[PDB]
Amino acid sequence: KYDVVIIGSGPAGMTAAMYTARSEMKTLLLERGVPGGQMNNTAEIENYPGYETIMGPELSMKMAEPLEGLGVENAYGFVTGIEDHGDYKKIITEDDEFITKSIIIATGANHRKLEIPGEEEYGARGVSYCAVCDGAFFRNQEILVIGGGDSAVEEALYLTRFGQSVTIMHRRDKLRAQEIIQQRAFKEEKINFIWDSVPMEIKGDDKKIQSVVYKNVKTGEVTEKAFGGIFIYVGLDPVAEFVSDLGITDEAGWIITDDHMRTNIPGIFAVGDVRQKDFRQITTAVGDGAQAAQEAYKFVVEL
Amino acid sequence: KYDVVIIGSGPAGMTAAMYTARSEMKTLLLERGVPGGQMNNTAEIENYPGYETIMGPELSMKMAEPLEGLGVENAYGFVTGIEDHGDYKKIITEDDEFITKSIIIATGANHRKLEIPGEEEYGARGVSYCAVCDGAFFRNQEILVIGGGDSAVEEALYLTRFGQSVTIMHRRDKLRAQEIIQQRAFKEEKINFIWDSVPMEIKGDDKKIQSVVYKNVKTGEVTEKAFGGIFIYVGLDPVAEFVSDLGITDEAGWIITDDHMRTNIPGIFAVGDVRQKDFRQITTAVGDGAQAAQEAYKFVVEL
Numbered sequence: 001k002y003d004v005v006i007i008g009s010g011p012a013g014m015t016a017a018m019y020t021a022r023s024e025m026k027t028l029l030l031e032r033g034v035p036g037g038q039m040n041n042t043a044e045i046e047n048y049p050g051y052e053t054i055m056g057p058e059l060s061m062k063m064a065e066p067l068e069g070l071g072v073e074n075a076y077g078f079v080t081g082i083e084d085h086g087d088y089k090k091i092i093t094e095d096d097e098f099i100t101k102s103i104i105i106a107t108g109a110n111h112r113k114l115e116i117p118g119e120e121e122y123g124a125r126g127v128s129y130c131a132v133c134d135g136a137f138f139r140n141q142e143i144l145v146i147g148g149g150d151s152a153v154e155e156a157l158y159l160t161r162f163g164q165s166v167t168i169m170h171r172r173d174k175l176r177a178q179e180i181i182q183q184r185a186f187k188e189e190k191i192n193f194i195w196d197s198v199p200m201e202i203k204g205d206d207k208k209i210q211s212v213v214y215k216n217v218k219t220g221e222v223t224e225k226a227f228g229g230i231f232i233y234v235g236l237d238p239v240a241e242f243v244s245d246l247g248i249t250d251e252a253g254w255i256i257t258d259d260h261m262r263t264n265i266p267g268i269f270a271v272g273d274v275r276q277k278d279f280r281q282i283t284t285a286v287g288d289g290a291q292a293a294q295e296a297y298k299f300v301v302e303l
Numbered sequence: 304k305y306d307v308v309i310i311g312s313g314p315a316g317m318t319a320a321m322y323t324a325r326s327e328m329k330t331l332l333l334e335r336g337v338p339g340g341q342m343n344n345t346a347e348i349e350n351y352p353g354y355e356t357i358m359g360p361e362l363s364m365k366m367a368e369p370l371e372g373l374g375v376e377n378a379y380g381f382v383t384g385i386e387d388h389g390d391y392k393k394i395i396t397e398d399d400e401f402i403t404k405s406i407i408i409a410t411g412a413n414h415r416k417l418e419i420p421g422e423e424e425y426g427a428r429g430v431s432y433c434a435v436c437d438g439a440f441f442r443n444q445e446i447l448v449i450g451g452g453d454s455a456v457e458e459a460l461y462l463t464r465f466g467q468s469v470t471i472m473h474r475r476d477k478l479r480a481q482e483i484i485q486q487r488a489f490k491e492e493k494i495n496f497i498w499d500s501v502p503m504e505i506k507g508d509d510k511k512i513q514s515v516v517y518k519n520v521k522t523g524e525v526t527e528k529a530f531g532g533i534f535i536y537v538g539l540d541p542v543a544e545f546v547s548d549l550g551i552t553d554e555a556g557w558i559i560t561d562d563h564m565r566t567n568i569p570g571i572f573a574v575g576d577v578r579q580k581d582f583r584q585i586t587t588a589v590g591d592g593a594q595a596a597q598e599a600y601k602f603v604v605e606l
């Protein structure tokens with residue numbers, strides 16, 4: 001009844017849907033929230049070819065714009081499950097079911113948690129996983145950013161707009177971030193570093209964060225230091241709970257595909273960050289999305 | 304001496320270079336002509352996520368813009384050959400040599416020729432492979448477009464701005480183009496179709512084209528009909544003459560890679576249209592380019 005349903009409207013899904021709709025496939029694009037996915041939690045995007053710098057939510061709007069007009073059917077849905085009946089598939093949301101010949105899973109990835117004490121207790125009140133969302137609540141604070149990759153270092157640079165100081169705590173003595181971003185952080189006077197360390201405890205009042213306890217991973221030296229905010233960027237977990245049962249995931253829960261975005265299950269493809277892969281970028285989300293869209297077209301034609 | 308040299312500055316190369324430069328790799332981007340590659344011969348681009356419609360040369364300029372500032376070294380060069388010495392590679396242009404630890408080949412693809420009589424004789428004078436380049440020289444003419452894929456049908460639609468009429472001649476009774484573009488062509492009153500036919504001869508004066516002879520592929524019926532211009536869009540050939548000897552091409556001359564853009568030869572990657580693949584788009588050029596850039600970084604780090 002749908003030719004293709006695409007689950008998730010971040011850049012991978014939105015590219016897939018644009019392409020399926022241009023192949024005049026009966027296209028459903030389901031998204032639980034706002035079109036744009038992680039791009040809406042990104043302040044400044046500098047590496048999307050075609051734009052020299054653009055706010056994440058502006059790029060989100062631009063990618064979402066033509067979809068209506070191409071005839072993609074955009075709809076709210078939180079997908080809870082998928083059933084492989086052989087020549088059709090059923091997608092289950094909170095209130096609905098949808099029948100489709102093919103599915104493109106584009107549901108992305110989510111912030112990994114530290115799993116330390118205080119992390120949940122201070123969720124509304126000093127702990128954040130999103131700088132563009134929360135940063136201005138930390139004006140004049142001493143902010144702490146945990147992690148050494150692209151997200152930690154970029155989001156630290158952004159947060160220097162608000163904080164008195166921003167400190168990056170990384171568990172080794174070399175960052176994983178792109179060298180250009182590393183160099184910017186090294187040069188920025190409002191960024192400090194706690195190398196070779198991991199956080200152990202986040203402490204505060206009833207009402208807000210006050211301090212973090214942490215450990216040096218080469219010596220075991222333990223330190224406690226005052227901070228007003230903590231932003232955590234320690235990696236990603238897959239957002240694929242609705243396919244746990246299906247046999248298409250690895251041990252960590254990422255969706256396994258071949259190089260044409262095919263899973264085990266014929267007619268089910270996956271694209272973008274939710275796939276098992278090392279390189280998570282808008283450019284490769286877009287690429288994945290287009291390739292899936294073409295493979296879906298062909299799968300459906302063969303049917 | 305270079306960490307990476309990227310050969311070709313269409314969208315795959317320009318994405319690769321942006322990424323290598325952001326990893327602070329010593330980056331050379333060699334291009335024989337204008338940055339943009341095929342995008343400069345494209346009138347209107349509707350399917351690049353992030354832009355709802357954009358002229359090909361405008362998107363080319365936008366992708367080229369930040370490269371200087373990131374520290375990519377942009378240089379003229381026509382590459383004639385590459386030598387694999389083991390821990391370095393030599394790239395040979397018309398006048399120069401360049402030594403590099405890794406190479407990303409992004410040289411794209413070129414118009415296939417009909418190989419029929421009159422095709423060369425009328426090259427300056429009625430035969431074209433590029434509508435945005437030549438179309439306004441055919442104001443008020445009866446134009447013929449050969450082919451049934453995305454290029455033929457899109458470029459026919461563009462050419463209706465100039466021609467009295469534009470006729471698409473396809474060798475089957477169903478187009479290969481994306482359905483949205485097919486439907487636009489079906490509806491456009493200035494587009495006619497010659498189905499199930501191939502051109503046999505292009506005829507004219509000393510000075511210009513006047514007529515085409517063609518054949519119906521189901522009946523052998525031969526017809527000759529008057530046209531002022533002929534635009535040929537019958538597919539693509541690889542632009543990889545500089546690696547013929549190297550053992551990295553298929554029988555047709557496309558560069559073979561795995562899913563991380565690696566060839567046989569370690570430290571030589573290829574991206575975008577020049578690779579062996581079915582799906583040639585800006586989105587997948589960009590994707591390829593980013594993935595190559597990451598793999599080059601890692602190759603060079605290991606070295």
Ligand SMILES: Cc1cc2nc3c(=O)[nH]c(=O)nc-3n(C[C@H](O)[C@H](O)[C@H](O)COP(=O)(O)OP(=O)(O)OC[C@H]3O[C@@H](n4cnc5c(N)ncnc54)[C@H](O)[C@@H]3O)c2cc1C
Nearest residue numbers: 008010011012032037038078079107108272273280281282
């Ligand atoms: C802070 C930050 C900065 C970044 N900056 C850059 C950058 O500058 N350049 C760059 O190239 N990359 C950047 N990235 C990486 C990039 O954003 C991602 O690679 C890209 O967004 C992945 O797109 P995607 O479509 O696969 O998933 P996502 O963007 O993750 O979109 C997934 C969508 O699926 C939806 N969804 C999830 N589950 C369900 C469900 N069960 N039912 C319905 N809908 C669902 C979500 O709401 C979401 O909208 C950044 C990442 C972060 C975190």
Ligand SMILES: Cc1cc2nc3c(=O)[nH]c(=O)nc-3n(C[C@H](O)[C@H](O)[C@H](O)COP(=O)(O)OP(=O)(O)OC[C@H]3O[C@@H](n4cnc5c(N)ncnc54)[C@H](O)[C@@H]3O)c2cc1C
Nearest residue numbers: 311313314315335340341381382410411575576583584585
């Ligand atoms: C008429 C037309 C319309 C199109 N429209 C669309 C569209 O709307 N959307 C879409 O997604 N895709 C479109 N495409 C496909 C798209 O343009 C290509 O997929 C894309 O440009 C491929 O990029 P690339 O970087 O691999 O190669 P190219 O863009 O082909 O760039 C290759 C570059 O390498 C250079 N080069 C070649 N040989 C050498 C040498 N020996 N030394 C130095 N430099 C060299 C060339 O000058 C060129 O600039 C279109 C194609 C055509 C022909």
Ligand SMILES: NC(=O)c1ccc[n+]([C@@H]2O[C@H](COP(=O)([O-])OP(=O)(O)OC[C@H]3O[C@@H](n4cnc5c(N)ncnc54)[C@H](OP(=O)(O)O)[C@@H]3O)[C@@H](O)[C@H]2O)c1
Nearest residue numbers: 147148149150151152169170171176198233234235279280
């Ligand atoms: N501009 C961009 O292109 C951009 C921007 C943001 C994100 N992304 C991409 O998105 C993906 C996710 O990025 P990411 O930065 O969120 O995650 P990531 O690449 O997994 O990096 C997580 C970082 O946090 C470190 N870490 C893990 N646990 C820690 C702890 N307990 N204490 C201190 N440090 C710890 C990791 O250490 P190790 O390094 O030791 O593992 C790593 O440096 C990546 O592929 C990334 O390239 C891209």
Ligand SMILES: NC(=O)c1ccc[n+]([C@@H]2O[C@H](COP(=O)([O-])OP(=O)(O)OC[C@H]3O[C@@H](n4cnc5c(N)ncnc54)[C@H](OP(=O)(O)O)[C@@H]3O)[C@@H](O)[C@H]2O)c1
Nearest residue numbers: 450451452453454455472473474479501536537538582583
């Ligand atoms: N908007 C876009 O995304 C866009 C725009 C342009 C190009 N592209 C991409 O670029 C790549 C190249 O496109 P393309 O259209 O140039 O080439 P293509 O996809 O190979 O199509 C060539 C078309 O010409 C036909 N043909 C071959 N020889 C012929 C002859 N002698 N007489 C009549 N018809 C003949 C082919 O027939 P058969 O179909 O029988 O083989 C085919 O329909 C494709 O992957 C395409 O999708 C994309």
